[PDB]
Design a binder for this molecule. Structure first.
Ligand SMILES: *Nc1ccc2c(C)cc(=O)oc2c1
Ligand SMILES: [K+]
Ligand SMILES: [K+]
Ligand SMILES: [Zn+2]
Length: 355
């Protein structure tokens, strides 16, 4: 069966200076409501949220970073503003730390539910997001790297070398996730993201296809960067067909984590892409063929409330075993073919399935 975790307390994190900032509290309540409306909620096993512990945060983050974000709990508005401004694209309220702990702890409980056999797969409707967060810093609406921490947490209750695949289909590069595992061959990081040769957030060449990992982790970092404007279902289905799925099958993960931002969705003001809810359903359904179905979908970005609610609900529908909706309709944009070919050339030395 399918687990679901959601806790309205994660809505308390808010922007006190700009109440229309796109990373809204109602992102998670709208997704939760849509699950209820589509009668998906009643079909799931409800997994309780919990706080991550500071020891658990230290799986990926420095004690300094943990301490600094923790300290924000007690700050007056002026110092919250000052601290937030020390990072790239961060706002902080007194509730932020607690919400970031709940987001992480919720995902640990979800991974635990899967790994103990209580559920086969699970969805986590959480905020604030995580994948921009680095070992030592907050970034891009993210405080702690929830997905990265969850991979380590999974390893901490099974085997240090448990093979974890992280598929990051948030429209942005998960810079923090890449860096945390860059020298690691136990965690395969595969990200699809708008890149625009560095013009798209977070604006680093770290996100390019030629960054394939370091040391023993060489080959275990797969960046699929998009250039030249809007991409959609055809391009994402093709990237999964040619790259994500062949590499994933060869890696043979024992657990799949999805950094599931829905900002590549049709309608997203930040992403500018047009992946459909049906498209996200097919991506989910493909990932379910891995790791004996052990997949945990973790909300990252995604800022059109209707788009993210429809899209994530479709993912949960697939997890629950529903038939994929009818769909990949068009030839690829030429720059997407170039992107896919660039990644294939970059990773053929490491994956026999690409040769
Ligand atoms: N990084 C960023 C911050 C704020 C935004 C708003 C308010 C709207 C938008 O379309 O994109 C944004 C991107
Ligand atoms: K991504
Ligand atoms: K890696
Ligand atoms: Zn994003």
């Amino acid at each position: 069966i399918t687990g679901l975790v959601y806790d309205q307390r994660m809505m308390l994190h808010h922007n006190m200076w700009d109440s229309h900032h796109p990373e809204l509290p109602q992102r998670i309540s709208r997704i939760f409501s849509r699950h209820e409306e589509l009668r998906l909620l009643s079909r799931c096993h409800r997994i309780p949220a919990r706080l991550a512990t500071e020891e658990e945060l230290a799986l990926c983050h420095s004690s300094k970073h943990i301490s600094i974000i923790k300290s924000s709990e007690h700050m007056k508005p002026r110092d919250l503003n000052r601290l937030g401004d020390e990072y790239n694209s961060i706002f902080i309220s007194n509730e932020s730390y607690t919400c970031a702990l709940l987001a992480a702890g919720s995902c640990f409980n979800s991974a635990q539910a899967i790994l103990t056999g209580q559920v086969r797969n699970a969805v986590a409707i959480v905020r604030p997001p995580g994948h921009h967060a680095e070992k030592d810093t907050a970034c891009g609406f993210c405080f702690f790297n929830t997905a990265a921490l969850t991979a380590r947490y999974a390893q901490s209750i099974t085997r240090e070398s448990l093979r974890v695949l992280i598929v990051d289909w948030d429209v942005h590069h998960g810079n923090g996730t890449q860096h945390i595992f860059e020298e690691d061959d136990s965690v395969l990081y595969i990200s699809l993201h708008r890149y625009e040769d560095g013009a798209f957030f977070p604006n680093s060449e770290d996100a390019n296809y030629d960054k394939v990992g370091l040391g023993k982790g060489r080959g275990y970092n797969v960046n699929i960067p998009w250039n030249g404007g809007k991409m959609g279902d055809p391009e994402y289905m093709a990237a999964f067909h040619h790259l994500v799925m062949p590499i994933a099958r060869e890696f043979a993960p024992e657990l799949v984590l999805v950094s599931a931002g829905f900002d590549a969705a049709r309608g997203d003001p930040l992403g500018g892409f047009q992946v459909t809810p049906e498209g996200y359903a097919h991506l989910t359904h493909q990932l379910m063929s891995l790791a004996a179905g052990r997949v945990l979908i973790i909300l990252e970005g995604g800022f059109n409330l209707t788009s993210i609610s429809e899209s994530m609900s479709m993912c949960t529908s697939m997890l629950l075993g529903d038939s994929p909706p009818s769909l990949h309709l068009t030839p690829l944009k030429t720059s997407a073919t170039v992107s896919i070919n660039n990644v294939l050339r970059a990773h053929a030395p490491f994956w026999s399935s690409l040769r």
